[PDB]
Design a protein around this ligand. Sequence first.
Ligand SMILES: [Cl-]
Ligand SMILES: [Cl-]
Ligand SMILES: [Rb+]
Length: 129
Amino acid sequence: KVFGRCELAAAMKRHGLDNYRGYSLGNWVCAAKFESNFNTQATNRNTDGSTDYGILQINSRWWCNDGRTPGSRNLCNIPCSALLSSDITASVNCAKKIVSDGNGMNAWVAWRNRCKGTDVQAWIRGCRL
Ligand SMILES: [Cl-]
Ligand SMILES: [Cl-]
Ligand SMILES: [Rb+]
């Protein structure tokens, strides 16, 4: 599923991500924009043999099981395919674990490089939320 911007903002709020670990909703929308362009089905291989999945490009080396990533830990206890669903619950639940792991949203390099410090409220501006 390809979300609209305000649509995704609303879905993320509905699943308790607004201000989770102190990160405002616009941070999460911005991260999703640059990780997946709001496409739940996005997948991308990493140089190391792992793959990133879904709306927040969650990585099969630590977080989900895809059966092809030696050493995976599956800390979200989910198949990586669950992170591709039109329903964002599994991706939200797992992102909550990732952002709690110690480095906050720096776990998403694209958030650090493209969102951090910017006017992230722009991502929710105009939205009926
Ligand atoms: Cl915001
Ligand atoms: Cl933090
Ligand atoms: Rb596990």
